[model samples]
Target chain A: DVVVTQTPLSLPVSLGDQASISCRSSQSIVHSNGNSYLEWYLQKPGQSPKLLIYKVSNRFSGVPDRFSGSGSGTDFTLKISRVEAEDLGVYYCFQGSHVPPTFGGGTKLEIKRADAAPTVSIFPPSSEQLTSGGASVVCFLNNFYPKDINVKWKIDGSERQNGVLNSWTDQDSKDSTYSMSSTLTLTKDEYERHNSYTCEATHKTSTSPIVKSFNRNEC
Target chain B: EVKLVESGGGLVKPGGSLKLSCAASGFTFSTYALSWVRQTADKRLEWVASIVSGGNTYYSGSVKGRFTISRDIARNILYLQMSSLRSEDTAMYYCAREYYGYVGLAYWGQGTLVTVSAAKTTPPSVYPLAPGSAAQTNSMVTLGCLVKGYFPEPVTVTWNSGSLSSGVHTFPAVLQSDLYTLSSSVTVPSSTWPSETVTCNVAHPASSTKVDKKIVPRDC
Candidate 1:
């Protein structure tokens, strides 16, 4: 087992700024089987961390080329090309190829706020399911500190004509977090086939968007 | 050749305790570690933990307090237990062997069911939001999503809008298991302002879900 750690619990940067976080392991993660077992994940505030790099540097199946990871052995780095408004919150790293996989203390990346405004965060952003064609998927927006917000559903970058939105404020947190879900009813023929879909969240005034997509086979 | 054969089913009243076993066959159990997972009916897989042939146990950070993993070396049986029943705890449990630490789940048992009744326990905190300040923008933005900690299987992350649309931006989650929480992030960019939202989601041995935040323009 390896002990992984991150630096600078929080970082403030302007849009277009360069950001980087370090993921260090307790021992040399090169396995006896001859492979570097290190990997990195990025978790925005309120959302589950998503895999950025694996096997040290091989980007997973659908990751963007701009987001890259470089480092080996005990030290690793998860770098974003140019920080955007949506790139906020903590970053974490984990060493998977080892026993008792471990995650690093997260690094928070925040916008260098010159002014204060409302903010929203989503949890467990993406997931998979084995469905015939129509599978219902849900995405949650936890810690929605603001009231009077709206949620919607879209697929393949298009809006579904008949979709619904529902939200509830956390009585304990008082801050409103929402759970928005949708169901894609597939025909018998479509259910037997595999396909992909997407989900998006919208706010009253902000442009920083959150989206999640799923595929039948990947489920 | 390896297989995880789960024990027979059992029904317990609310407040009663339950323990289920997953027996290994077809392969030398010593060479591989046994992993236990829980999936509520129609829910995602939740990693319970893993046990080696030596009896050393590892539990998922989310399941540490209420769940336990034990093994019987002679019979090559791995046991999973949950005390103080609740309906929310009712789920299909499974056991599998993690062969190499970072590829994927190699072998899985036919899952067993555990139902809790009487007092319901809060579901394990599915996703805990990290601490940070929120940013708003009107231009396209990309957020990095990541997850770490687990073995044998590589975790995945993606970014989408509204519902999950597969292959949008997929990456691997951390594979280490010792550190309870695995982290992963993604960068999401949308041309519109305050109209689109980007989400970061993670998949691992236990369950696959997402943590999302609404992104608004700074001045809108």
Candidate 2:
């Protein structure tokens, strides 16, 4: 029983391409009973982990034929012959022939991108909402691609801090494009003084980010 | 102990976007990852996206192209943005924590409904008279299971001293809003409190799932 290690944390995969992620166990994955128990798993971004291969070369039930497994003992190979959009995510090689089941560090597969810049917008707070001391405003970005985007916020002329910030991407059943949004909150007093805030959306697809600003309503 | 309360939403058009909100409290907002999930009307669970604190996001392969999950630490809320949504995307959404080096959703928010179109016919679910009231005494006691909520009233409520008390169900009155909630009580002679067991079981033919609420005598 040995540690299972995985390399190249991230892999850029192309559609219809062939990609292989390797798992190397510190010792032979063979059990004393003369059986190999190395397994391969793929964990999608937000879904449950799916078993791709079990007992070395055997594929799991219902797994696509393009995913093949091979190798024995201390080393193993899990290959995807025809990579599809749904086949991307973190891949982990695990071994159960040993005492406690152990999994590799994990390999993340990202689609090599040919993306366009994301759309940016700043959504101001509603007048119906009120706070004891200040107000909360939201800034969100949309229609981002490649699962990677950056959003930053600036108040007046200074970068905002102590303010909550976030950004993320989405896709549904219909073949759709990826998009993300972020929100920020600040004190109404601070906001009323400068009356200026900006939200910036940056992505790999664009050289310069898309920036949008929101001004405070007349106090 | 973290709490996630889903807010807003009920209907939307195909390809239109809506933001799902999950209000959080009781834990450090920036310390753990939050994952957004969806369960369909037919009860299919799908992980939409997971966002690490401060915006490192990972979208499930199924949704990496359609949904985004993020958080606002100031208000302790996690947000899921559904872009280019489809009618099929219509499902109840939830928020839960995704601890690193962890196995599955450790904490989950009660589902908030999201109907893609104006087309819905779930009149609601009801379990009538599940211990609506119980009285206990020295020589004897009586317990009733008061079950209510949802439609087509079939007045069938069953109780168990400890095991499944096979009973049937139905009803009228559509007090629809979210999921099913019920309870039952058991009272033995004051002395039997040490070893008494009481249970409640309710069922609906419309769905295969069952609700089992039981309890051991505690006052003893």
Candidate 3:
């Protein structure tokens, strides 16, 4: 089974900064048939996630070229060249070509609001055992349109160090709103017994920073 | 613009077998490949397998061991053979193509139907059930149906009842492969014995007709 992880649970960059998300696998994603099975998906707020990339960096039948994936072996990257308002929402990476498929935590992207403080909401703000060695946790904002949200695993409530964060905005859409998501991978031990692992989602639309937190052990 | 037209309706008896063919035209017989697909009345597609104009054949990942596909290049026809007749084997079988790219299917032939009846028994009168009682209900009942082997055609099973109100309840028949069997059993409550079924209606794909039987509960 391949384990996928993303970084920067929440990013508060302005409209122009380059946002990126990283995906890593526990084992090499190379299939026995000599092909890589990495893919990317975008779940904009309430909509179903759509495939962005498949068979590694190869775009699906009609994905835009701006949303690109590149990486090899245990490491992979999903890049958005110029973030647009439409790109605001959670982004996820999935490994379908492999058995026991898995998804990254998620990343959220929010526009920097000047008037009020940004608001953040996290759902099921706790982690539970999905299987013996695997666990899953998700975070999101309520009624968040142009849904730009990010999810990340952090140690000691500090900056993300091990994974990548990708963010984008689509200019073609009517709503200038955007969103993003991030994921992180931890061993069963790191997830089961860790004293200080936090899953966070952040929104930057308001004056003050908005953050929601989940402690794995408390729940 | 290539086309493959399949043979129409067929009738067979229980404890017997059948074979159906799809004949193609409008293109060189030796150029394109031909395949068979089965879609139950509910519309779930099942790929039976494919055969090339040159006589080469391929079966689905799971059904290969039990089903076989063959082709006659000169006749522009593909064949599907199921040895033992059973109610479950009855389905709307179609012939299609293995177009390159693996994207999805493009062409399809008119379907054929195979009706399975009692081994030498005369066709039962009235098809044995109320018209509207076909609707899926919570109670249990028995369903009796047969697969005939008299004609060289394939058959499928379909439920004519109103919309399925709950999950499907299927009971395994006593008979195995190689012989046509008429099966019946009491439909147990799904909450308890979700895997059991009370009735089954045998159908033919090419024709919009079906034959069904219901089982009455017996005192334990």
Candidate 4:
């Protein structure tokens, strides 16, 4: 399979600032007719993908000069001379030089924002009993800027290792910030005991780890 | 009649093999090269392999390992054999006569549908095409049906309540993951729309119940 990789999966740019994204193909994209079948598309928010460039540097009909393409063979670059508010979406590069066209993983162009710490909240197990005799708790981290975040669970004062599942981070549709959740499970007997559970999160935005605790008595 | 005909398209289990044939008539087979191309379910066209009148063959890198191309000038036939087939090989294959190396394809076959999977069939979900309201173009209005997420291809769309032919259009099926999606539309004179109710009937291999939708254009 032809693999297409794009660099800077997440881009942060301000209005009017120039932005560039690179697309590299595992194999050469030169066709027998001496034409490079590389194409670029931009999928704006809530809109279908629109073609910007085709056959390498040739812009599609009606595409503005502000969006340009350059490169040959296996490597290509797409540049926006001046970024506009309408350009805040994902860009993808598709190669059709070979059979079975392949697409890049997509590069998101997002507005630059200051790093913000995530809001950490922990909740005790639901009142409903599990048929399998266990209780599940959740730790939600919301509104964090930038993707890197570490989550851990603690029982009493010691960190718990098992029975924890971390979820993938997702961007909020409206705010474009990151949010994720981790779940911790405990046995029925363990839930019946009066013990405190804590959730800790660490991000580059803060020096100290954010912590949220919950106790059975509080529930 | 100058025509190109292609055959040998059907379902095949993974790892199975198949040979597609293109028969040429009304033209000297040795005078022009024939190219084999396929369209993925996603509507992406892929050039698989090609063979020249001199019997020199060229294959795309994507299928170089498993696809072979050859021609029989005396019998006016071009052949493409695919081995070690996988789900990725499933597509609509066509044969085209080339005009030099850069003049673009001159004549093309009607296309043969090749399916290379044993997955269970699935029924498609049908919906209105778009613009919840009616759209007026010139003196006519167009109504569309969106069919999505069906398997094993080979679906037919027809207008049940109308006896029209000139304005009907059925688009190519797009392969999405393991399912197939496509759209069909019909255009009618604006003078008879809104009051005219159109029903789009969808027939597929997996449909247990009648899959159809009635479209009544909203006032522009």
Best by lDDT: 4
lDDT of 1 by residue, A118-142 (tens): 3323322222222222223334343
TM of chain B, each: 0.49, 0.54, 0.49, 0.63
In Å, residue B11's CA in model 3 sits off its true spot by 2.6
What would the per-residue lDDT of candidate 4 be over residues A1-219, giving only the tens digit for each residue? Answer: 687888878788866799999999988776875878777877664333556887778776668999999998778999997766667777888776665556677788876556878765555543332344656666666667877899988888888898776654334344556666666767878766647788899999988889877565432
DockQ of each: 0.04, 0.01, 0.02, 0.03
Comparing to the true complex, what docking class would candidate 3 get? incorrect
**lDDT of the structure predicted as candidate 3:** 0.50
**lDDT at residue B25 of model 4 (Cα atoms):** 94
Instruction: State residue B84's C-alpha deviation in candidate 3, in Å.
Output: 0.7
Candidate 2 per-residue lDDT over residues A79-99, each given as its tens digit: 888777788777877665653
**Predictions: Cα RMSD each:** 17.3, 24.9, 20.7, 14.5
Reference contacts reproduced by model 2: 0.00
Count of clashes, each model: 123, 28, 68, 3
List model 2 lDDT by residue over B78-99, tens digit each: 8888888887887778787743
lDDT by residue (tens digit), candidate 1, B1-220 = 6767776444455666777888888877676777775655433345568776566777766667667887776787777877666666666677767644434345666676554443222211122222122334334333333332233232344445425442122321221222222332232334532355544544443233334433323221
Against the unseen true structure, what C-alpha lDDT does each candidate score? 0.51, 0.58, 0.50, 0.71
Which 10 consecutive positions of candidate 1 chain A have the poorest summed lDDT?
A170-179
**Over 4 Å off, model 3:** A1-219, B101-103, B119-220
